[PDB]
């Protein structure tokens, strides 16, 4: 299996399913009427829908109040070239939110990709986060970083009912914080013997996080995003994996966990940036070097896999392609060991493999012999 290909697109489909299913409940006429009732005396109300889910209800009435109580008075007998243009500028202010919401729902056919300031003001976002069914620490973190709540939510049009526009906003509940996460990066590890090559590349790169007893692997780029020490992940985008999976970082050749790799008979040079440095796979045919934003090129790198620290350098290059290192502080450690690829005989290496357990590569060599 290719875990990344299995997980791809799952979180987006699950989010839309979740939102569309609730929208189906809200779209009934007796549901809309109950909602309009609950908001008859207030601008905010908590309620439980017919299907048993609890939601926040908000009423936005400024444009109705301006139309009923100011605009309609001023237009006596269908005449609108009045000399009070305050009336005209006021309208243009009072309808901007509504007009913006219409643009966003028409452009996206009723499902926005995220939550504009017109779907939800900063004030309304703060109230919605404060009402979420989670604990105080989670709410505090979401409140103080609510732009990230915004980014990961979206909106759905329920419909137009009378002169009333009804839509729903799905806000992400970050109900688990400050459990351990870690990230694996890797680059091709190649061994050359007599101008032939045996290469492998770890295929389990990406984010891992623990939660309530399990480890979840997030194989795809869009599933997680960092802000300093914190990494925001969508649980629906991950695959639960055995805790034994951490052995691939320990004894990848010995372990009995199925550490996924790809293989090749020809080297690939490239740079895998890591949070505190870079891996540079430098093989025959290219030149690699590391540089400083201050003192220029430092040093050319030897062939093979080299690990560069963001305190050792500011840039690493392959030929002319420049990669800028991060400036994040943290401790770097080398865990020495003979590269697994150098235990291969390039003359007995299998055909190129994509996303196979590493022990099936060793099996392939011995069953060929």
């Amino acid at each position: 299996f290719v875990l990344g290909a299995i997980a791809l697109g799952v979180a987006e489909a699950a989010a839309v399913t979740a939102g569309v299913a609730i929208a189906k409940t809200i779209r009934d006429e007796s549901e809309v009427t109950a909602i309009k009732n609950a908001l008859k005396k207030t601008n905010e109300a908590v309620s439980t829908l017919g299907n048993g889910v609890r939601v926040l209800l908000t009423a936005v009435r400024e444009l109705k109040d301006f139309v009923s109580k100011n605009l309609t008075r001023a237009i006596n007998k269908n005449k609108c070239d009045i000399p009070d243009l305050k009336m005209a500028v006021s309208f243009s202010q009072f309808n901007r939110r509504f007009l913006n919401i219409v643009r966003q729902f028409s452009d996206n056919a009723g499902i926005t990709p995220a939550i504009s300031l017109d779907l939800m003001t900063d004030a309304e976002l703060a109230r919605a986060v404060s009402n979420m069914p989670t604990s105080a620490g989670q709410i505090k973190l979401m409140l103080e970083n609510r732009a990230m709540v915004r980014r990961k939510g979206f909106g759905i049009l329920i419909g137009v009912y009378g002169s009333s526009v009804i839509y729903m906003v799905q806000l992400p509940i970050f109900g688990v914080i400050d459990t351990p996460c870690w990230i694996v990066k890797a680059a091709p590890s190649c061994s050359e013997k007599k101008g032939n090559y045996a290469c492998l590349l770890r295929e389990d790169q990406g984010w891992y996080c623990q939660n309530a007893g399990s480890t979840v692997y997030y194989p795809n780029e869009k599933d997680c995003e960092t802000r300093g020490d914190h990494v925001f992940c969508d649980t629906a985008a991950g695959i639960n994996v055995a805790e034994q999976s951490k052995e691939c970082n320990i004894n990848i050749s010995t372990t009995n966990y199925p550490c996924k790799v790809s293989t090749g008979r020809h080297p690939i040079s490239m740079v895998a940036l890591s949070p505190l440095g870079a891996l540079v796979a430098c093989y025959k045919g290219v030149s690699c070097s590391i540089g400083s934003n201050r003192v220029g090129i430092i040093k050319q790198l030897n062939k093979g896999c080299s690990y560069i620290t963001n305190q050792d350098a500011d840039t690493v290059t392959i030929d002319n392609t420049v990669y800028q290192l991060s400036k994040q502080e943290g401790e770097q450690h080398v865990i020495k060991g003979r590269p697994v690829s150098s235990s291969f005989d390039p003359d007995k290496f299998p055909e190129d493999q994509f996303n196979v357990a590493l022990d099936q590569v060793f099996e392939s060599i011995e069953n060929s012999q």
């Binding site: 939110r97 049009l157 799905q170 020490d229 770097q332 080398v334």
Partner: protein
Amino acid sequence: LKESYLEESCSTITEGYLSVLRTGWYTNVFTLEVGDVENLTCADGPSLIKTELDLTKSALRELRTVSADQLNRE
């Protein structure tokens, strides 16, 4: 943060990150009241108020042809 370079596999693992995991969705239903702008008519030709009102009416009408779930068969 603590990064370990694993020489045996040309890989790194970096630890010390703290999770922020999306575990659920919270729903905030909005009702935006537009008011009775469709009983309002401007008979006296081009006006600033006329254009603003017509923006509002045509936006209100366009919005009903939008659907996130079922196809409109009118």
